Amino acid sequence: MTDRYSFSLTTFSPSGKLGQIDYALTAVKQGVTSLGIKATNGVVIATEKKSSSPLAMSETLSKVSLLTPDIGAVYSGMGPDYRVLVDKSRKVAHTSYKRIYGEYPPTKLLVSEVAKIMQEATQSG
Amino acid sequence: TTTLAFRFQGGIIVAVDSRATAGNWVASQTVKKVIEINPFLLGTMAGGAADCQFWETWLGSQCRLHELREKERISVAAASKILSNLVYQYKGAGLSMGTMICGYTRKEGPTIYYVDSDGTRLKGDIFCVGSGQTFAYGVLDSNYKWDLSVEDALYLGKRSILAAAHRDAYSGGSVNLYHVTEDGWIYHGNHDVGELFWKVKEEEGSFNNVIG
Amino acid sequence: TTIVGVKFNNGVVIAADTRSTQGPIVADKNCAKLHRISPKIWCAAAGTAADTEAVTQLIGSNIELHSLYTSREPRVVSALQMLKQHLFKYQGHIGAYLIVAGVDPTGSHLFSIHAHGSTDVGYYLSLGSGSLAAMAVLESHWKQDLTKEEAIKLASDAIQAGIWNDLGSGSNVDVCVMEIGKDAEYLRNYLTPNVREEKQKSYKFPRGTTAVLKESIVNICDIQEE
Amino acid sequence: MDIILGIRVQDSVILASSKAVTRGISVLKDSDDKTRQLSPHTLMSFAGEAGDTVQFAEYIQANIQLYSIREDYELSPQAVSSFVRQELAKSIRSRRPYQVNVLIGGYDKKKNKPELYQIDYLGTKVELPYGAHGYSGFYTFSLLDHHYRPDMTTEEGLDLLKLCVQELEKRMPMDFKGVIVKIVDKDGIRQVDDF
Amino acid sequence: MDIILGIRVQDSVILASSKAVTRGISVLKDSDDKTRQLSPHTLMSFAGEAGDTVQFAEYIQANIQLYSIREDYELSPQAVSSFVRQELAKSIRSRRPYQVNVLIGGYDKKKNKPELYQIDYLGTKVELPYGAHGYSGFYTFSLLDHHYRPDMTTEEGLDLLKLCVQELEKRMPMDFKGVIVKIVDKDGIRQVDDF
Amino acid sequence: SDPSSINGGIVVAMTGKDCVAIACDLRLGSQSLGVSNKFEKIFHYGHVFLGITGLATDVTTLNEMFRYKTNLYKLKEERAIEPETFTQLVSSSLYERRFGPYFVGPVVAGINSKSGKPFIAGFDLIGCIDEAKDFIVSGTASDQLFGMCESLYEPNLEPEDLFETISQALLNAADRDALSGWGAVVYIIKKDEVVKRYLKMRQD
Amino acid sequence: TQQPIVTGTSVISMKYDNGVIIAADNLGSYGSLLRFNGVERLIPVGDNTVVGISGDISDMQHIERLLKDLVTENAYDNPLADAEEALEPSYIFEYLATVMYQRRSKMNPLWNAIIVAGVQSNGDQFLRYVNLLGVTYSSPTLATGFGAHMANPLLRKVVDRESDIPKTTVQVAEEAIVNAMRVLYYRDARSSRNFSLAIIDKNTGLTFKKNLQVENMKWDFAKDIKGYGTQKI
Amino acid sequence: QFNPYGDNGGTILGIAGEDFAVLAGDTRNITDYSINSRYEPKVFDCGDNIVMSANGFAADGDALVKRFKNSVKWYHFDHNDKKLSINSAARNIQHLLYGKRFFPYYVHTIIAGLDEDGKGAVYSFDPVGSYEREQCRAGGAAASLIMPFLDNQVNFKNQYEPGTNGKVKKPLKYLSVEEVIKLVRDSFTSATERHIQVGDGLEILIVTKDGVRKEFYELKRD
Amino acid sequence: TSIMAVTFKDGVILGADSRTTTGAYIANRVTDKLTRVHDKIWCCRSGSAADTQAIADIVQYHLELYTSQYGTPSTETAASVFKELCYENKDNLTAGIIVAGYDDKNKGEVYTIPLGGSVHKLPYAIAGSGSTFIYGYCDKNFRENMSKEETVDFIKHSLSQAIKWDGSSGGVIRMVVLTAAGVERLIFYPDEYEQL
Amino acid sequence: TSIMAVTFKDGVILGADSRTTTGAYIANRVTDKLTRVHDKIWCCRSGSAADTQAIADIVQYHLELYTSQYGTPSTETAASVFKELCYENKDNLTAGIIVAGYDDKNKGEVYTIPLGGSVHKLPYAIAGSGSTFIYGYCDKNFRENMSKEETVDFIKHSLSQAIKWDGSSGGVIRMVVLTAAGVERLIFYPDEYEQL
Ligand SMILES: [Mg+2]
Ligand SMILES: [Mg+2]
Ligand SMILES: [Mg+2]
Ligand SMILES: [Mg+2]
């Protein structure tokens, strides 16, 4: 009943490749297409709702998620991994920013925090 | 509070500050801490304002009754002891009093008695009483001589209060000076510490620490 | 402080005075004691002002995250439960006394909560040093089936009773109305019955009145190029 | 008041008493004489609470001077010490007691003998060859136990007293500003002006 | 510990610190050096609770000596004082605070200037021309306010210091058994053996 | 014994037309003993000014803390912190020591660089924000300052008039407090210039 | 120095155009025990004065005897005892105020708060307060204890300043007093439903009303209140 | 334990002019956070062109004023209807206050009138009877809010003449009764804004050679 | 506070006043002191309102989780959970709780949990400040196997007296009836119970 | 202590338990707390046994001297003398006395004098530590103008309950009947009153 994996599962191969990151990028490649376009007075993000069954209610599955009132996110790759990242991203916007400065984080810094969470899954045990 | 009195060739110099505080709040900057008991005797106010004021005014009444009955000026020894014996009767009740009884008679010459609310009565040459007493003592002890002139002695007393007024938070406002002679006391004015400090700084070259 | 809450036909109204004091001294004459927890859940605060702001913002933050997690608009009972369990844990050391009101998919609600963690249900409530003055007005004029206009009137009258009769309360009346199926309308300085009269004299000084020893420019800019 | 010492030698009693008067933060005086002549051959030194010490001493002085005039006669040191003890013993159960400790050094002209009496504020009297009050005994008694002889001269008594004062000046934390020394013998009371 | 004084003159800092160590009733020592050399041009004098004073001083000394070896470089007096302040400021909210007040006298070899820092047990730091801790300032500051000049020589600074010590010896009730005096300048630290 | 009145001192801040002013005395004491006449109580992090009264060790500690935090803020945000944002940082930082607080009375003053709007705020020792339009007072003579400011202040004063008003408010308040005075400093703050003036006052 | 044992709660009062109204409940509490339910705390003195007393009941009974003794004493060698030399409210008050302050000054107070309501010889309304400390004040509305916190705010809405007194009728004033007594019954834990009310009018004289009850109470809304938050049943 | 003292709030202000004197006081009486009365007179005409106020614990304040008024009456009986001069009144009040040195009147007393040369006079007392003639004196709750303002606007403290920069002080020119009343009203308006115990009404008694006159002004009631 | 729970032929009835005080001020005059921890297990609350609400909420959580796993809990089980919280946290709690419930097997049961955290199964229980005044009345007038109407009258009369004498009690008399038939709420106003 | 006095048609009856305690030890289990100050004026004593005995002895002295000069005192007069002692010495006394008596003019009268020294004329009065438990019972069961047998039963049942719940009360129930017929003492033992 122990967590004995205190060592990295992502390591450098002889060629300098980080295998698990490359393989994660391959999983992203298989994922459904999503895009983003920046205008002068706005930004748009879009994706296909690839419904796994017609009996499924695809409205209940949100691929595009509000992170803060002025920030939104969309993905390609593994949906469950996205869902938990959105939960962590929403919470980190509050704990490491809003509860300190009384305002929502700017886009680049929230992105920085999400990036940090993803980096740690690339080096932690 | 800073009050002082000292004996010299020319009689007694009495010098006091003028500040009164209730906690941190400065209630008055125009308090008279020298009680003019009569034309020949002076008292200083430290400890309780009411206690010093009331009983040293009363002392003046007793000194007046003495000279009516005895047809002679009361001695400083006798005047001081009337006050010390009175406060000693009240010992324990909570009077607060630190005073110098200052006078100049024929038989005694210039005389200062430190009188105090727990019964102490001490004759002496130099006394300082109050929250700023230690600061005044420094200036006095290093510059005091018996053969000071009346002009220099008045300045020394003024300067010693200024020293305390600067450092002690509960002393300041203004300096009141008196010179006690055998023919009576002579008032030597009220001197604002604010104006006095800058004047003394420039003329004396002291207080280099302070920017002016 | 005087704070009240009053239920009505289709919602709930809360109100508060605008005086903050340190001992007998008035620190802010136009303080805002009405706090948003979520768009349609607001509370009026009394007690230690740092504690009331902190506890509202913490629960408001966790309520927002809960709303995003569940894809549902927040409920007043959730704000109440989270507030009370937090306050109970700190055994009254967080000196927050709150009147929590709002509308949600369940309906309109009005609760009070005290620093030790006890909660209360009612149609009309008051809290703070002016609560007895306020409750006197509420006990005299409250009825069942109040309209929106009657509830705003009653609530602001109850705050006025605090303003005029309680030394801990003063200045203005803030109101917030939370009606079912509508946006909550925050009415900041709804009443202003304590404007200071014009002074007898202008105290603007002649220029050069103050004695100056030194002048210098303070560099607020960053290290410059070239 | 701090240190008061007493030593009875062959033909005199020597009292040594500190000169400092401290009121809390500052030393207000460094030449205070903590003694009163009660009669021509009886001296009393004193130490205790401020005000009470002098009030008590002068009250005793007045009563012994009154006795002297009434009877045209000097009371023996023993008689004076008994009177003083009774006044202190009366004092201890009063509303507000005198907090005063005394040494009474006297020369009994009838018996031709010096006599030293130690009386504390409670009215605890003891006749001794040497005595002290407060902490003074703690530093000095080991030296007095060692060197004291009943047949000492006045000059030998003063030298032993200098050793006691030196030990006090070394090991006591307080600066008591030296001592005034007075000798009581058949010829009366006199002050040693250089010590 | 009782009296610690500091005075910054033209080209040096002078620290004067009392020699007495009193444990209640008796003066256990009269030659105690209440100072530690933190670096070749930085000296710290200290006064406060027994045990805590020396423990703190030696702990600071070790940390500055460690810094010196690691970087092969002497920290500026300002840097040393900031480090010391933070340790005291950390201490005040601890389970059991260090009750220690310090003066840090240093010569900054970069700026070619003497520097005196006064830091109390709370971590209250001030740079001063002259400073003290406890009751020492009450007696001495009126003399320093009067006589001090920023262009004084070391010999003039020592003479002004003698006047301060004399005033302390006159008006303080406690016998602090004189002072050890040390000078901090461009050439390092040295003790004035006759004072 | 009371930590907030051991060292003494005061801060006052005021708004004017397109400007703010913040001012403080220079005394540091150990109760009755005056220790320093150069203890400045106003600090700045970019264009945001912070006055702090109270226990002097905590004044120094909080200055070092907010310098630390605003430096990291600037590196990450790539811009200087604004008064409104800083005010929330001060509040958060104080409240995180709710049950072992810093014994201080902070005062924020500055102009928002984007909107040009004058801003002042004050706090109690645990971080309750007072965001006044008119003025903020702090320290051992806060009662005296409240009295001065309430009568002397009028809105929309020009920078050089505001200087006179705040100076006379500080000086006359300090002269009725034993634990304040020993010199004074006044900052007049405009959108892109700041003037600092040391005042001449009685030294008792 | 003592502590109060058997106690009476709020006394409330106000001025109206032609006189004064005063009221107080009929309870003598023994701490949290509602011990005695038939205690009269309004004590009339002649036909022009009513003294309302709260606080310690044993001290109230002592004061009651002093007032009775005062009437006897005023009649001695006084042919005009029922005319020009009758006791005034102002005389009765000043006497009580003297006694209260003297007793506090010997550190042995009468543990009460008293309101003297009446009408003077010239028709002027008299209403003034005194307590165990000898503190006195007058106002268009006066109340003791809880009444101060809850009754005064309600009564001040009717008579907010001196100029509102001539505009206030006896019907409006009594209504305000009766409503205040209901509010105190809702909210004061040491109050009772039964109370006494006295009106002293310059035309119609002293009307003393015993055995009044708080009526028209609102409790129905209580049925709809369930749990303390989440409970629906 | 029985506490014989209480705090009824209030704030009072005495100012001595050249040939007049004013003694002002708010009319609010309080205990804790409750208002007892919005109009309870605190400043009293005591006869002989003397006005008095004893602010603090209202019961001790009423007792002292009552005793002083009586002292004026008995002074007339004992000394052939002689007018009690303001300095003599002040000394008499010291003895009244010091008489209870070990159970004090918990009040800060101020009196105002004219001295024997017709010049304005104000005297100020502590609870146990220490006293001093003064030009300007606020007492009570908001005294710390009023006195700094008066130092600045009556005595022109910290004000210097433009152009000289600290070298020449603003000269101490004599204020008229109308000017003093403006400063009194503004002091109490400001005090009302920032002190919870100050408000409701302001009653000013003005003393001149012609007699005692009253003026009343409304203050904020929150 | 005056609270009681009484077993009778068909089950059990909980009764309570509605007054909550802070000192002499009545903070709430329409309080509900009868709170539900399960469909047919309720309790009467006395002592610290924060403590008894915090406890009751935790119990309701424990019995909800019990029900998900093991089906409907007994009244004894509910009393045990209350006891565990009250006993183990006796140093930091001021709670006096009466637990009352209806099983079909056991019928009406009443358990009282005083300050110490002890448990006492009783035919009826009284508690709260106002209970002191009705020990005599309740002991003389209680019978076992009363009807519903008799038991309502017994609780109504008892709490009427508790309210009459105790300043800390007052307002409305709330009651909750627990039987096989279901859960019935009753309320009785001052004009009704005062004249009894 | 549990004590009471009850007026009825023919006069008045005083009742009391017999227990006196020092801490938890019963110092006297057969105490007589019904004490005579005049032929037909008696009292019930509660509080400090030294104080109430000292007071009663002084009252008996005052009424004996009253009788020598002015004839038989009223019950109101006896209550007034009790009050005077209790009120004027309130700081140094712990006494709770019920005064009960029979005139032919006034018939049965009861006055209660609690700790403060106030007086309260009542149809019946209860006092002592055990009285708290029977406020409810006594209020529900008292009627005016009861017969002798009904009043004895009312007191017996009341003090039976007071004894049952109060540890400070116990032993025998003593009673003293005051009527035109004279003075009758009654006693009731544990085996009698416990089974009621
Ligand atoms: Mg100052
Ligand atoms: Mg000063
Ligand atoms: Mg108000
Ligand atoms: Mg028993």
Swiss-Prot record, chain C:
Compartments reported by the entry: Cytoplasm; Nucleus
Gene3D superfamilies, A to Z: Glutamine Phosphoribosylpyrophosphate, subunit 1, domain 1 (3.60.20.10)
EC number: 3.4.25.1
Chemical reaction(s) catalysed: Cleavage of peptide bonds with very broad specificity
Entry GO terms, CC: cytosol; nucleus; proteasome complex; proteasome core complex, beta-subunit complex; proteasome storage granule
One annotated GO biological process: proteasome-mediated ubiquitin-dependent protein catabolic process
InterPro entries attached to this UniProt entry: Ntn_hydrolases_N, Pept_T1A_subB, Proteasome_bsu_C, Proteasome_bsu_CS, Proteasome_sua/b, Proteasome_suB-type
CDD domains reported for this sequence: proteasome_beta_type_7
Keyword set, alphabetical order: Cytoplasm, Hydrolase, Nucleus, Protease, Proteasome, Threonine protease, Zymogen
Active-site feature positions: 1 (nucleophile)
Keyword Nucleus belongs to the record: yes
MF GO annotations: endopeptidase activity; threonine-type endopeptidase activity
Pfam families attached to this UniProt entry: Pr_beta_C, Proteasome
Note: The side chain of Thr-1 acts as a nucleophile, and the N-terminal amino group acts as a proton acceptor.
Family from the record: Belongs to the peptidase T1B family.
The protein's assembly and partners: The 26S proteasome consists of a 20S proteasome core and two 19S regulatory subunits. The 20S proteasome core is composed of 28 subunits that are arranged in four stacked rings, resulting in a barrel-shaped structure. The two end rings are each formed by seven alpha subunits, and the two central rings are each formed by seven beta subunits. The catalytic chamber with the active sites is on the inside of the barrel.
Protein name (Swiss-Prot/TrEMBL): Proteasome subunit beta type-2
Encoding gene per record: PUP1
Swiss-Prot record, chains D, E:
Matching Pfam families: Proteasome
List of residues that carry Phosphoserine: 76
Task performed by this protein: Non-catalytic component of the proteasome which degrades poly-ubiquitinated proteins in the cytoplasm and in the nucleus. It is essential for the regulated turnover of proteins and for the removal of misfolded proteins. The proteasome is a multicatalytic proteinase complex that is characterized by its ability to cleave peptides with Arg, Phe, Tyr, Leu, and Glu adjacent to the leaving group at neutral or slightly basic pH. It has an ATP-dependent proteolytic activity. This subunit has a chymotrypsin-like activity.
Predominant location category: cytoplasm
Family that this chain belongs to: Belongs to the peptidase T1B family.
PANTHER family xrefs: METALLOPROTEASE TLDD (PTHR32194), PROTEASOME SUBUNIT BETA TYPE-1 (PTHR32194:SF2)
Keywords: Acetylation, Cytoplasm, Nucleus, Phosphoprotein, Proteasome
Keyword Transmembrane helix on entry: no
Record bears the keyword Disulfide bond: no
Domain of life: Eukaryota
Official protein name in the record: Proteasome subunit beta type-4
UniProtKB/Swiss-Prot annotation, chain F:
Recorded GO MF terms: endopeptidase activator activity
Protein family: Belongs to the peptidase T1B family.
Cross-link for Glycyl lysine isopeptide (Lys-Gly) (interchain with G-Cter in ubiquitin), residue positions: 69
Organism of this sequence: Saccharomyces cerevisiae (strain ATCC 204508 / S288c)
Gene Ontology terms: biological process: proteasomal ubiquitin-independent protein catabolic process; proteasome-mediated ubiquitin-dependent protein catabolic process
Compartment(s): Cytoplasm; Nucleus
Annotated GO CC locations: cytosol; nucleus; proteasome complex; proteasome core complex, beta-subunit complex
Keyword Cell cycle: no
Modified residues (Phosphoserine): 30
Role this protein plays: Non-catalytic component of the proteasome which degrades poly-ubiquitinated proteins in the cytoplasm and in the nucleus. It is essential for the regulated turnover of proteins and for the removal of misfolded proteins. The proteasome is a multicatalytic proteinase complex that is characterized by its ability to cleave peptides with Arg, Phe, Tyr, Leu, and Glu adjacent to the leaving group at neutral or slightly basic pH. It has an ATP-dependent proteolytic activity. This subunit may participate in the trypsin-like activity of the enzyme complex.
UniProt xrefs under CDD domains: proteasome_beta_type_3 (cd03759)
InterPro entries in the record: Ntn_hydrolases_N, Proteasome_beta_3, Proteasome_bsu_CS, Proteasome_sua/b, Proteasome_suB-type
Tree of life domain: Eukaryota
Record keywords: Cytoplasm, Isopeptide bond, Nucleus, Phosphoprotein, Proteasome, Ubl conjugation
Pfam families (UniProt xref): Proteasome (PF00227)
Gene (UniProt): PUP3
Subcellular location, principal: cytoplasm
Protein name, UniProt field: Proteasome subunit beta type-3
Signal sequence bounds: none
UniProtKB/Swiss-Prot annotation, chains I, J:
Superkingdom in the source lineage: Eukaryota
GO molecular function: endopeptidase activity; threonine-type endopeptidase activity
Gene3D superfamilies: Glutamine Phosphoribosylpyrophosphate, subunit 1, domain 1
UniProt keyword list: Acetylation, Cytoplasm, Hydrolase, Nucleus, Protease, Proteasome, Threonine protease, Zymogen
Pfam families: Proteasome (PF00227)
Main localisation: cytoplasm
One of the GO BP terms on file: proteasomal ubiquitin-independent protein catabolic process
Catalysed reactions, semicolon-separated: Cleavage of peptide bonds with very broad specificity
Gene Ontology CC: one annotated term: proteasome core complex, beta-subunit complex
Subcellular location: Cytoplasm; Nucleus
EC number: 3.4.25.1
Function, as annotated: The proteasome degrades poly-ubiquitinated proteins in the cytoplasm and in the nucleus. It is essential for the regulated turnover of proteins and for the removal of misfolded proteins. The proteasome is a multicatalytic proteinase complex that is characterized by its ability to cleave peptides with Arg, Phe, Tyr, Leu, and Glu adjacent to the leaving group at neutral or slightly basic pH. It has an ATP-dependent proteolytic activity. PRE3 and PRE4 are necessary for the peptidyl-glutamyl-peptide-hydrolyzing activity. This subunit is necessary for the peptidylglutamyl-peptide hydrolyzing activity.
Record-given protein name: Proteasome subunit beta type-1
Source species of the chain: Saccharomyces cerevisiae (strain ATCC 204508 / S288c)
The organism's taxonomic lineage, starting at the top: Eukaryota, Fungi, Dikarya, Ascomycota, Saccharomycotina
